[PDB]
Every structure is written in C-alpha cells, then in structure tokens.
Amino acid sequence: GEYPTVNEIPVGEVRLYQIADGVWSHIATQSFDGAVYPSNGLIVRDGDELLLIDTAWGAKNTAALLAEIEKQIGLPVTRAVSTHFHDDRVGGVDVLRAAGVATYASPSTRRLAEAEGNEIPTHSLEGLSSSGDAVRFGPVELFYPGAAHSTDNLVVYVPSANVLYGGCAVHELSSTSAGNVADADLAEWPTSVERIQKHYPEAEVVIPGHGLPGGLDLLQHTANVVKAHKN
C-alpha cells in the first residue's frame, strides 16, 4: 500500500501506484554508474486507451512496464510522451515503438537524445519551445517551465485530478541535493520552478521524477535544494 521503493523493487520489475481516478504512477529501478536508483513515470486513462508519460528506464524495464499495465489495468497504451532526453525518460522508446505505441517528445528532446546516443521518440511536439508554453495532449497538459534539471524538461498536468507530474525538474521532499545535475541549469532552475508554482496553484498531488509523491511543498523544497547545491 505505501509508495514503493527499490527495497521492494528489484531491477527489472515494475510497480504501479494509483494516484487518483484514472491516474497511476509507474516505478522501476535501474543501475547507473554502480548505484541503484528508482524512477517514476505516469499513466493516464484516455477513454478506452492509456497515455504513458516516460519509459521505465531501460528496454527490459519498459517491457516489464507494458506487462504490468496489461495485468493491472488491461487497456492499451497508444501514445507516450518523454519529458526529457535522458535514459530514464527515453530508454525503452524502441520497445514502445515495437509494441504499437506512438512516441512523442519536443524537438529539443529529440535533438538532445539523438546527439547523446539515446533512444529517439518518433514524433515532435511543437508549441513548447518558449518557457511558459503549454499544449494539450489527450487528457493532460504539457508545460515547458524553462531550463532546470535539463534544458528540455517538460512538466505534465492532469486537469481532471489536479495531478502535477514534475518529472526530474521536481525532487522529493527527502532529497538532500539536486540529483544528477550533469545537464542542469542550476541558475535558471529556481525561476523555472517558480513558473510551475504560478501556473499550477491548484495541484493536489505533485510527483517527482524520482522518489515519493507529495503536495505543493515539493516545488519549494526543490528550489531550496537546488539553490543550496549551486551555493
């Protein structure tokens, strides 16, 4: 019943967690540079179909994700959006594409994925290139807050449930640093978080890219840990 962690998640297995009516997160674990990390994504019911946000960080994890969705939900995943270019967001796009899923990301994410040798979503999401931009995509709104964890990071809001999926631009409350900052803009990140706070003041659940969901406090906590990481 509690939100799952690695200690319940061997690498290769996937858990789903019901967030709200028609909204689940997915949780998987992966090894990277000799350490094991959890990571989240989102699943949103879209009538008789499902919209997937982010892969489960790897090909085998993403295959396991599709199997877990069939077991627990039983509706087809028809579209997926990746919220930035890192492997915890696009690793598994090839699996999705061979399982009938149409894969999408911004042009900025597609270019960065291609340049870095990561898997590349098929379709480009226009209308998101300026900070503060928002577009509708099925049952969600996609929002580009500005550079934060990465220059391309997108945020996803589920208006029916007031669920804010921050992706890796948002950290969990227990975080002690800003995570993997390799491609981050620590100077711009607080401004981007402030844009999220201003745009989604009615969010009830906030889901970070890694770790435990909570409420709006995750946004302020993220700004706090990023400002202190920078300093």
Does residue 26 belong to the site contacting Zn ion (CB under 5 A)?
A: no
123 is in an annotated binding site: no
Catalytic annotation, pick one of 133, 180, 199, 224: 180
- The site partner of 28 among Zn ion, ligand YL9, none (C-beta below 5 to 8 Å per kind) is none
88 is in an annotated binding site: yes
With CB under 6 A as the contact rule, the residue among 210, 219, 223, 226 that binds ligand YL9 is: 210
Q: Cα 93 from chain centroid?
A: 14
Does residue 209 belong to the site contacting Zn ion (CB under 5 A)?
A: yes
Residue 21 annotated in active site: no
Does residue 171 belong to the site contacting Zn ion (CB under 5 A)?
A: no
Please return the burial class of 186, using the count of CB atoms within 10 Å of its CB with bins 0-12, 13-18 and 19+.
middle
Least Å distance, CB 32 to ligand YL9, is: 4
Residue 180 annotated in active site: yes
- Closer to Zn ion at the Cβ: 22 or 209? 209
**What is the contact surface with Zn ion in residues (CB under 5 A)?**
86, 88, 168, 209
